[PDB]
Symmetry: C3
């Protein structure tokens, strides 16, 4: 089979690809390096993170149904922990976790057949208590397996996007001092016992898009134009989310993320089950600022789950008009 | 276009309307006044509330797909805060939030086209940390945009209800003294910092229907007769819910609340995503008392999420019969 | 009508039955005895439990749509509490709760018509605060009402399982001393006030399958062979869950659990609403160990929500292959 070597790009962007496969099955080659580093979640909040390829989430991989995925995974000698990878897209050996455990200084190559279309989570799962801990330290991303003929709607009609954005939502459990301030550690292992105690409450300290509070706002705001069909692929590897585009809708939504199921239409808010990825297409109709949020608004605003989309184009007064301006 | 002026009625009731539109598109005119007042959630629990039209939830608006909605929103001079409105039914300007910010003593008129059929949340969203806070202080309601030809089932067959009840479920975060008792404040702003600390735990002190524990029980119990097709429209603007009618089912359920999607049948329990409204139709078959509950039973019983429905009519022993009475 | 007397078997197993009804409607006779006993959830964690038939969950009942269910429920004189039963499968009298309240030393016989196909929760619901408390002490199980002609897929094609496993997931709220250790009590009533305080936080101390941490792992691991179509019926009577088979998928999933609705395909993770049962069919394609988990991995690993499935058969390198073994 042809081999295609991909250069991954950091989230929320996606590597070059075609929606309709330009060929028959290929072997898709990807490589990622695991990076353990402290990351700043918020102004005075830091996470002893563990990442695929230096980003939270890990980068988006895009292939077609019936392709193979050949991943080279590298755990550099400077890392402290063993790591591996479980693709929810894959069949067998705990998603590949059983075949990919690598120590610092080792690398491994896994091949699987992408037999099922949809957006899927991938995450680290080295075993026992390590599983939740590695995930909530940042080790999860998404692979999207498109149908060979591209996406289809609830009636089997071909559907096309202009842009995909990968929104990786992640919950984190940063320990606190009695006064509410966040603790700092020298490395992941040092912070482990304190982190577990927070994990046990099931209350995240932060819930973020793209690895940090405000990462996709201000200078990181997403961009589009009136008329653009934008696919928002949304992963949550550990906890539920309820995405909502403020000012918009989900035109076609696969909330369970699997493309051969019929999408729902006209949604205000949809539901990403923890341990899954979903996808929503929207055609922008009005210019201006939109917020893409987890619609538990405490999670959106206090915890960090808010992105902005800045949209250019002409305003349509038939859809909405301020008839009487604030007056009094 | 014809203009139709509506008189809103408090929840769980609905203003006069027709399921099948008796005309082509109209401009629907509504008016609401924002009322800031302390409300009693429970025996020794009070909320510094902020409300649309004096009720929690805000009143239900009912229009047809392709109509316009023209809302006059009034923030009386006695209020302390700026307020606005985001309709999830609307397209643009953050659902209208960007065009409706009004200070105490001001009013505003917004028009939008109700382009999509379904039950939708509306809520206050004045910006930043104000967003979750105004919502969890009571500022959310629902607008139902019916298809012009009325509801249709999973097979496109016309479906009709005898009664709609609007169940507005709301989570609240009342601060507590060390001994578990609830704190009281002079106004919303005074209670703000203490409320935020509760919000951060993501654990509501109360989760209520119609603004208070027991509001829809005893004297407030809902009523129906055997044979009645009752539509239960259920909103939750901030947190997930799992409605269940104890003793009944959802005959047709749109849990994501958007009427052009096929409903599911025969449900025991359905799922309202935080930041959305859903709808369930049930035809009553047995007389007696029913409980409509959020089926996290701690949320139902300890937090306040229980309504009763009292149903009159004849008992059917073929469906259920006590064969041997408690004996021993 | 013919009467059929069933011998229940403990979970995760199911009593003898046929998927396609070998006859017209029958009256299905079941009997269960309520057992109040302390149970060990985990190494140093015990629950003052209240059970149907001595198991958590209560045993699975299997009947066909249009059958009757006649249940004899027995509350032995050694018990301390009144108990009853609410079948979500049933119509009227709070699912039967209104007709089945029995004191220690009493028994009752309830008949209902199983008019709706699907997996349904049954649980104890003796009234008021007793409701959540009896459920979170273990009093819930599942009844599966199969269509008379067996299961059908999203296209109406007949579908057949080789094995059903009933996974009863239950959240528990065991009180703790200041040092994090769990408290012990002489009986359920003694532990009540302390348990309520934990219930109020909505944070379970344990979330288990089959009544205990590790119950379905090691010696209790589930078993299958490559090629087996296994139906996983999953109940959660009080709290949401997000089941995921690590290394596999849901081939056909009814997450709301009602068999006349079309199932979704190829799911990675699905969603069981608190107060419901859902069902997922998977055909095993690879041998080895699988984990069936609630995919909030903290709930899976720290709280107890993990089962293992051990699968025998031949490995398929086309689906997955370790191309380069860990090396360095
Ligand atoms: Cu790792
Ligand atoms: Cu996983
Ligand atoms: Cu407001
Ligand atoms: Cu909103
Ligand atoms: Cu009981
Ligand atoms: Cu129930
Ligand atoms: Mg690279
Ligand atoms: Mg400090
Ligand atoms: Mg230090
Ligand atoms: Mg008025
Ligand atoms: Mg006090
Ligand atoms: Mg004072
Ligand atoms: Mg027996
Ligand atoms: Mg102790
Ligand atoms: Mg003692």
């Amino acid at each position: 089979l042809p081999r295609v070597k991909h250069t991954l790009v950091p989230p929320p962007f996606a590597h070059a690809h075609e929606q309709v496969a330009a060929s028959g099955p290929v072997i898709n080659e990807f490589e990622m390096r695991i990076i353990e580093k402290e990351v700043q979640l918020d102004e005075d909040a830091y996470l002893q993170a563990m990442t695929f390829d230096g980003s939270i989430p890990g980068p988006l991989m895009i292939v077609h149904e019936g392709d193979y995925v050949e991943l080279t995974l590298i755990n550099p000698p400077e890392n402290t922990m063993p790591h591996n990878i479980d693709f929810h897209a894959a069949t067998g050996a705990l998603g590949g976790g059983g075949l990919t455990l690598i120590n610092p200084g080792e690398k491994v190559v896994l091949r699987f057949k992408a037999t099922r279309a949809g957006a899927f989570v991938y995450h680290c799962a080295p075993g026992g208590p390590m599983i939740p801990w590695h995930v909530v330290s940042g080790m999860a991303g998404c692979i999207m397996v498109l149908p060979r003929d591209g996406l289809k709607d609830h009636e089997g009609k071909p559907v096309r996007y202009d842009t995909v954005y990968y929104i990786g939502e992640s919950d984190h459990y940063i320990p606190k001092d009695e006064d509410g301030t966040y603790m700092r550690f020298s490395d992941p292992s040092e912070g482990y016992e304190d982190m577990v105690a927070v994990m046990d409450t099931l209350i995240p300290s932060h819930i973020v898009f793209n690895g940090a509070v405000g990462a996709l706002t201000g200078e990181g705001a997403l961009k589009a134009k009136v008329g653009d069909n934008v696919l928002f692929v949304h992963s949550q590897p550990n906890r539920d989310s309820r995405p909502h585009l403020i000012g918009g809708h989900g035109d076609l939504v696969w909330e369970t993320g699997k493309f051969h199921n019929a999408p729902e239409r006209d949604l205000e808010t949809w539901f990403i089950r923890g341990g899954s990825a979903g996808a929503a297409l929207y055609k922008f109709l009005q210019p201006g600022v939109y917020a893409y949020v987890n619609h538990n608004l405490i999670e959106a605003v206090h915890k960090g789950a808010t992105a902005h989309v800045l949209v250019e184009g002409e305003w349509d007064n038939d859809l909405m008009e301020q008839v009487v301006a604030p007056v009094g």
